[PDB]
């Protein structure tokens, strides 16, 4: 369960036919996870907003996406999901870039096509269209001869920060404000983050890079953190089992529901233990530590997303 997996979850890296092909909708949990292993969701997003045509991630899939910083911990487990993945399952929305948004300095922007960053109050994703790639400063997309095929290698996709998350248990609204009140004292020097007021200040210095850990709960914005403890709690619910009968494709949503509710399909040790086991559809576990629980201010929390990334901050002029 907790062992890092140097391999795809359920399906191998694909080889596609033509860049004008249509991407059909699906229904099954395993059916959609197999798509997440092929980087089809980024291919849909780049169409929806960036007007880009063609698949992304040829021959490598999700196993060959770039991260900054390169030294990344959670990327080893194949069970953890990135925000671009969570969008595919109706868990959040990564909104399009805007003029008022500020791009972080530090990462290697050159030659990329899509990259997404966590912002104090959401997630912002920059993309480029057909036959283009970014410049070093990441301001405007310019033509590149390396994108003629339209089936780009998986290296051309960048995800900033070490982030992964899971389903969330709702929390009363009044709790968020009284955690935010305590969070004001952790970083008193800073006043505004990403154009949002954090402390009551009159004048501010220019934006600068800043480092912090954070959690997402919903509402207006996230909760930054200075010092905190975390822990991996195991639950082994029904979402931890995905499966794929060999030869054609993932098992249909009807059969998936049957195998997830009747216990009449082949399974592995944990699956046989939880529900029992009788070609067929052999269903297994995932390589993740499980579920995350974080403790802050004594009153420990179950987050929606937890990670680490770089942000923009301003200091009060003294």
């Amino acid at each position: 369960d907790g062992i890092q997996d140097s391999g795809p979850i359920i399906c191998a890296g694909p080889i596609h036919s033509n860049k004008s092909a249509d991407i059909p909708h699906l229904l099954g949990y395993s059916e959609k996870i197999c798509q997440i292993d092929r980087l089809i969701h980024v291919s849909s997003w780049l169409r929806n907003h960036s007007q880009f045509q063609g698949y992304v991630g040829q021959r490598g899939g999700r196993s060959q996406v770039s991260y900054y910083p390169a030294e990344n911990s959670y990327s080893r487990w194949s069970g953890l999901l990135s925000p671009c993945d969570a969008d595919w399952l109706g868990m959040l929305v990564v909104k399009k870039a805007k003029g008022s948004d500020m791009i972080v300095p530090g990462p290697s922007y050159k030659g990329k096509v899509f990259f997404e960053r966590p912002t104090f109050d959401g997630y912002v994703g920059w993309g480029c269209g057909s036959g283009k790639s970014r410049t070093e400063s990441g301001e405007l997309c310019s033509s590149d001869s390396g994108t003629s095929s339209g089936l780009l290698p998986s290296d051309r996709v960048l995800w900033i920060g070490d982030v992964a998350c899971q389903p969330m248990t709702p929390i009363p609204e009044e709790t968020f404000l009284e955690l935010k009140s305590f969070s004001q004292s952790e970083f008193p020097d800073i006043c505004k983050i990403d154009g949002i007021v954090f402390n009551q200040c009159e004048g501010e210095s220019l934006p600068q890079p800043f480092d912090v850990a954070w959690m997402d709960v919903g509402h207006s914005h996230k909760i930054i953190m200075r010092e905190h403890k975390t822990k991996w709690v195991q639950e082994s619910s029904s979402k931890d089992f995905v499966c794929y009968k060999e030869g054609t494709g993932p098992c249909s949503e009807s059969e998936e529901k049957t195998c997830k509710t009747s216990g009449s399909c082949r399974g592995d040790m944990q699956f046989c233990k939880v529900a029992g086991c009788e070609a067929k559809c052999r269903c297994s576990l995932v390589h993740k530590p499980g579920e995350v629980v974080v403790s802050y201010g004594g009153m420990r929390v179950r987050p929606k997303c937890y990670g680490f990334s770089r942000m923009m901050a301003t200091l009060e002029v003294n």
Epitope: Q64, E71, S145, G146
Partner: antibody, heavy 123, light 107 residues
């Protein structure tokens, strides 16, 4: 269709000068980035300098041993990289490679390596 | 900063061998690996996050941990004798740094 040709080297007595050329054709030369790396027999690769494109401005940068003696430029019309060496010393005798990035986009993900050219600096 | 390589290594024909390039500048950036048979020009084998170009078999692998990157090859064969190099950038964000070079031979 992708080719890289080095020409313009030769024998030079210490204290001399010479210009070297790395030409190419078969694609668009207006966008990519170019660099220079030499290695003497028995010695590994060593960075010298690199010239960028007009998208940012084509700024220049050379390492300390080379800075103050050598220079690097390019010609868009003739589509060729050029390097100029002056005040040559005995510790530069080597074969020279010009590097660029074509498919694997990235500042230091060089993939296309030219044949290389020889330079012998001795009396 | 600086990038350092093992001077040389050899492995018999039939198993897996690993080559390590270490450097404090790789905490935030990847490094790329190059192959050169004595008497010809270098050829790129590994870049990015385990990205192998067309023409290179998937029998190669690349990984990273801390400030150390590793290029790894399985099932050794006598025709793969060469020397290998690792390159990256520097902290100032203006240069390109090369390593020493590892001479790999197959026994």
């Amino acid at each position: 269709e992708v080719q890289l040709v080095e020409s313009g080297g030769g024998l030079v007595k210490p204290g001399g000068s010479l210009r070297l050329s790395c030409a190419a054709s078969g694609f668009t030369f207006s966008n990519a980035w170019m660099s220079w790396v030499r290695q003497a027999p028995g010695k590994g690769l060593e960075w010298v300098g690199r010239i960028k494109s007009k998208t940012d401005g084509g700024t220049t940068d050379y390492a300390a041993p080379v800075k103050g003696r050598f220079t690097i430029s390019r010609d868009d019309s003739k589509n060729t990289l050029y390097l100029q060496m002056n005040s040559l010393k005995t510790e530069d005798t080597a074969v020279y490679y010009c590097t660029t990035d074509f498919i694997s986009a990235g500042p230091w993900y060089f993939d296309l390596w030219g044949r290389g050219t020889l330079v012998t600096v001795s009396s | 900063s600086e990038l350092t390589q093992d001077p040389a290594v050899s492995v018999a024909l039939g198993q897996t061998v690993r080559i390590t390039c270490q450097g404090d500048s790789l905490r935030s950036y990847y490094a790329s690996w190059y192959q050169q048979k004595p008497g010809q020009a270098p050829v790129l084998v590994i870049y990015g996050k385990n990205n192998r170009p067309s023409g290179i078999p998937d029998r190669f692998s690349g990984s990273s941990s801390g400030n150390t990157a590793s290029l790894t090859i399985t099932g050794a064969q006598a025709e793969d004798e060469a020397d290998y190099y690792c390159n990256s950038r520097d902290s100032s964000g203006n240069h390109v740094v090369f390593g020493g070079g590892t001479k790999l031979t197959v026994l």
